[PDB]
């Protein structure tokens, strides 16, 4: 495969976590989210009603898909994957299937996974795409609520709060889930990269189901290991998870094909580390601890030299930009480089 | 104790002799960016990034748009200052970059008129004050307006700023005459400010780097005509005040609060002044920017604001300890949790 | 089936009546509707580019699922049934099809139907979906053409003044009808009911396609006689119809809407008003006493039939306070 | 004066009550307003908050000053009084001095004093206003907090529910009431008739500068004895110059449950009972949500006229 | 075929161009092109990003379909042919397929198709649609990078200002111009005409997709030559093209726009403009006599040539007034 | 005075007439305007209540105050003339005393004067502000309504038929003409022209209250003849009027009686100044059937006849729907310019 090839030599890609959670950066009604800010509705149980009213603040008068791209482009990033829906169940893109979306909800009205594939397109970049295909904190079938005896950056996996009666994630698979799929993979070009995440609560046949869906709209897709249950093309390991060399150079009983951490099989060879430049996913005010040059620097070659790829997040601010720490790590960390 | 009915029974001069403690608020267009443009920072004063960066007001303009702050709430923020025994606001109407927080007839580059938002900011805050029976008092820029091609400043760029230039010497590059933004929006402006939001307590006016004596004499007046028990600080410049205002953050050492030595620049802005009626106030912040800033995390510790609270006042001196808010309306969480903090070490 | 027992158990539900009709609230331009405010587009020959401005002014402020159901739940109410679309062919949900609806024309830019599928479930109310298959006055090959012989609560059936010309039904069916019913019928959860009305033009095969899709997508649904010719699973009876005791201990012409038909399931409902009309009115206060509303429910529950009393919301979304008080009375006559 | 010798002669005129209660109709969270719709802000006291979000659903696309003024007209109305600002405080101007009015806070942006002023000079009626000057429940200082021991078509006469400090009409009087009488009375062309409430709170000398004001910017317009300043034109009787105000139902303001509506021959005999002694009938209409006459009031009013030949 | 008979008999249509182009009408920034208004991006290679904000400008306060149909059929104009989408890749109907389009991205909030739909049905008139298949400028895939048949030259026609990279225009064909033609020929009734353009990229068997597509869902719609590569029920001959009468007497390259080609049924239609542009342009007053178009109109009648005569509406939606005169003045030579 | 002596060798100006009657470009309902778009409403006699629709579409998205000034310093125009609110009263402004204007009414909801007050103050140009104090057809007291005897570029010089009753101008010199002089001589910094047109209605005394208004808020301001009554500064000739030698000479066109409210010809000049305005086409406002612009060579002449005389040119842009200029009007003006060394 020429998707193979390439993403085996890729090295590097931005990953990027924009949403409804960026306007609140963490803080909410005087209170904190965990160290991921993105999790901040599920950490402060926050009512899918009164969620929703930070749609009408929504307007980031400064996103500029275009400038976002040639940044990546300068660090000597080989593609971009982008939060088209995260667990909080808000589209970042034109869904006809649920108009809980940045086009029909918010001033904004312009859909951002549109622009930034025109952008990746024009500058050279691969495109990929993260959906929730489990969690989905905006529907009573959102999955997670078989989890609930697993910590989390949160309270529950699930929305717990407004929704407290019988569940069957089969619903929202049906409904949702499966259709917003069909629409990222149909409406934004060719796909490169298709980040799932914590699959909590799909079965083997829902992950086949989507798996199939993908490369029947995308053949070239790479799907990774958070689809769950072993439907995968390649590994991704644990979030900010870098490796010792030892296990890295072995790659490496029994794998939990759903647990998000930690080496899993791979057929084709193919490794990748998302990490983020501070803590959190989301945009996360009270969050500087950003990353030194030096240590993104070598959290990469470190990674690259055992042939594992490093997606390096950024969280855009309410506003739709790089926030200037991030910016100054990742043009610092590039200065590093011969 | 000899007032009309609504008004306050301690004469303003001997209220603001104990009052001690009370809470500023800095909020505007730049709470937007908080403290970063077009990846640059501004100094540690992010309501001075205008300045920093020289951002066009075709540029800056643009942030009216994104001005919908959803979670502002007049009544949680004075409550917050009540339950901390801050016993007055004082409010930014109107700050270097021109931009009024409330509904001016004169001025369309205002909170009401040039945003979503829709609301007027002075007039939410000034009613929970009367029911709050906290003091209301009002900031004003009266001499710096970035927006205003006869703003002030343009005298005075031999010394160094919080941004680059005192005045908006981007925009406007031609021929400068300060009477004219005197006569067509300062005035007009405070007019507006001092007749459309009740009994105002303290007038707050700052860096006066180019309005003579006699336009400190005519705002003075004018707020006295409007406003009789108002009090003025030392900033509106020229000698033309009721109470001295300290420098930014400027706690005096012992020696110094003690003896409040003048034997004078009147237009500087740090060190004491003289003051018949005995009358001194230090404004602060609890990080280092007035404006709201997202990269400054350096908060002043519960312990420390208790601390420098108490040496003011022990030498007579007021502390007005500034919350910039969010550009959704916030108090950012560490300042609510280090004002509430600095509550729990009294009794 | 589940859904069976439980219908013929459900004993009383709540309907809903609501759409740019009730913020004319019976009159137009100086004249009245008749006692069916819902039909005034009909009885006062409005054209549609008139009645669409009606758009603009709907912004329902008090509009709240939430308190719609919990008034039903507290009046022992186990099912709620709400007009999708009515006869004026006006969507209360977010159409793909059609973008004459709540969220794409009003400002109140909300799927009513959502909110109301989301209330229900979560106070555990089963939930309805009234959809007028036949008559649709927005479209030019909407029903009724064929039946102006019959009297109406209007002038006649179809919109025959907008729409003059030749007519086919079948081209609204395949267009409109059918594509909003699969939408309906696929984006609201659930539906344990659907209320299909004046099957006055639609054949046979149209009313098995309808029968069959429901099933498809809501394989629990029960479907009333006024789907027409036959399909469905359970009998409607007249507006406000209280039959008297010879006809209902005994429970024939399949696209009439009085009196009874045959039940294979033995499943039987009366949809009635409070006040005399399905859409607010403001002019009729001639709201059935507390008593009135106990008598018909225990009357219609004693020989196995449902009642299902209507609410037509006002044009803020609120039950009117006379509406609700009766309901409240009526329960308060329960022991 | 010409303004006096044409009201003796007037006979008959058409009030109108409209404002953000009407869309409430007399009913809010399931309780009544009284018979007066109103006043359902001070009966069921709501707060300004709350209230305040009536301003989003205030879109009447029915509304029609011409055809307002030609209703009037075809009864032989000749002249209309319209309420500029209730008890509620709500403007239904462009104010200047206050946001709170319906071209600034609604969705409708539209000056309807304005466009009612146009109406009645093409037409040749004679314009009129209503303006609550004492209570106003949108200012802390609002009158009535002196009046509450007698009983009202609400609770209290002043906001006492968000309000609940000291109050001081004379702040009131200066920042808003004078300023508002001061618009009203400069930007609508000449005003014939200035209708006040009865005084619970104002003092004499309130009284006459609201009198004064009045008379400078509108040197032709009538006031009446309701003022209590004890200067007046015309003698408001109760709810040579006379002129008695009523409703055609039992309400002021639109009332959806209120259908008691006067027959065409009451309404026929009233007007000439009254003029036959000299006094003029002036019939309110309490305009709906949509901004229209209500049916049954059309009915009314053009029904009497059919009375008269 | 009834449509087949009709189209012979016909004689005389109107055609529409409306779009954004209509408020630049042939000037942009201090820049002008004298070419085909509707031809604005490419002529002077206005950016996507730049193009778009003319949406927010896009409110025709004064377009009535209902007025402008009545003018084609006091002309005698037997059929109307509208843009639904030109080179541009704007739409002037509501597609689900891409929010860039006269209902999701202007304030006129409208759907100018459908109201023209609605409009032709009332009067009679049948209704045909215009689309774009093969260039559109909006898409990164557009048709046009192949020049054809000449080579290089300057002879291609895509979007290559804004779009610099490998293209291939089968994704394109795939993602909007199957759907959106699919939408076209399926919401808004009985389609008589497909006029298609500039068939440079399609292959043959897109081509017969398209043609297919259109017969499944329109059975009677006549389909024009410009579809390309012989898929077609009629031949268009040039843009304005008067043909020489021996030429026209005796009547290949498929995808050439210019000339006669084979016509088994016998059809043929000369689409001309009023004055020189298509699309409404603010410079071009070279306004067609009354008396030109009367002969131009009997000259193509005569050899069994339908004239389909364009009006450009401007950015409020009307017709020109002079155009509108034009036109009345050759109904008024007519008998 | 210093503007006496800048007027004098100021030559040449740029005048600007832009409203909603631009968004109509002299066709509505199929109908014509006169050669006079910006008449429109008065030609075709339409109802303030349709007229105001056109607020709606007012969104000129490609207007740009510092481009429009810069194509006038460009062609070395030494001031810009706009109007604040033409004969249909439109305001061009944010009024606060008529929300009928381009800030509060339109989704365009920006001050074009106030933009173009900031372009020309930063590229040096002097300011000037057009007001018609006389008609104004959103008003029913309007002026023109004893003035219907002449013929006009519409139908009647008032609005005569939304206002069919008594009118007495008086009421709305007060209450609008007054007032929002006050406004724009107030708001939009050093005013240096002030061009009033059509004084068919308003006393001497109503003049003499506007020059001494116009005087008190901007001292140096010169006010044109039109403002009625020989209460002027500089003296405008008629539109479009290219005197001959011999009156130009003389600055005189007969030898006794001057009619002060009169539009067309000489009238005394104790500053010895003067100022005809003309057009590019035919029209002041856009007008989309009106193509008849002027060449190069004739505007040169125009100017250099006038300029040779101690006459100064100001010349008219009528801006179209958008905001902009159009191509053939810039074009005509760039090569006029070019004909100069
Ligand atoms: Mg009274």
């Not at 593609?79 to 649920?98: E, I, N």
């Not at 060719?190 to 799932?196: D, L, N, P, Q, Y």
């Not at 983020?276 to 040059?293: C, L, M, V």
Request: one cysteine or more; hydrophobic letters at 35%.
């Amino acid at each position: 495969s020429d998707t193979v090839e390439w993403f085996k030599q890729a090295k590097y890609g931005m990953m990027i976590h924009w949403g409804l959670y960026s306007l609140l950066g963490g803080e909410y009604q005087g209170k904190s989210s965990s160290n991921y800010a993105e999790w901040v509705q599920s950490k402060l149980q926050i009512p899918n009603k009164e969620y929703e009213r930070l749609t009408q603040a929504f307007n980031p008068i400064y996103f500029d898909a275009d400038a976002i791209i040639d940044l990546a482009k300068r660090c000597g990033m080989q593609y971009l994957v982008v939060t088209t829906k995260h667990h909080d169940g808000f589209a970042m893109y034109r869904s006809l299937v649920d108009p809980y979306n940045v086009y029909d909800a918010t001033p904004f009205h312009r859909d951002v996974i549109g622009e930034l594939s025109l952008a990746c397109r024009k500058a050279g970049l691969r495109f990929g795409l993260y959906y929730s295909q489990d969690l989905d904190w905006h529907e009573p079938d959102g999955g997670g609520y078989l989890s609930n005896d697993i910590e989390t950056a949160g309270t529950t996996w699930d929305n717990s709060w407004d929704f407290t009666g019988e569940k069957n994630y089969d619903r929202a698979f049906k409904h949702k889930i499966m259709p917003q799929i069909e629409e990222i993979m149909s409406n934004y070009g060719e796909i490169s990269v298709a980040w799932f995440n914590v699959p909590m609560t799909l079965s083997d046949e829902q992950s086949q189901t989507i798996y199939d869906t993908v490369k029947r709209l995308q053949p070239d897709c790479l799907i990774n290991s958070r689809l769950g249950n072993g439907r995968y093309d390649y590994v991704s390991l644990g979030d900010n998870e870098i490796p010792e060399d030892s296990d890295a150079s072995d790659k490496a009983g029994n794998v939990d094909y759903n647990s998000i951490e930690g080496f899993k099989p791979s057929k084709l060879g193919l490794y990748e580390t998302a990490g983020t430049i501070n803590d959190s996913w989301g945009f996360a005010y009270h969050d500087q601890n950003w990353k030194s040059p030096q240590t993104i620097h070598d959290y990469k070659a470190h990674l690259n030299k055992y042939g594992i790829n490093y997606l390096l997040n950024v969280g855009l601010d309410g506003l739709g930009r790089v926030p200037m720490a991030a910016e100054q790590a990742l043009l610092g960390a590039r200065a590093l480089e011969a």
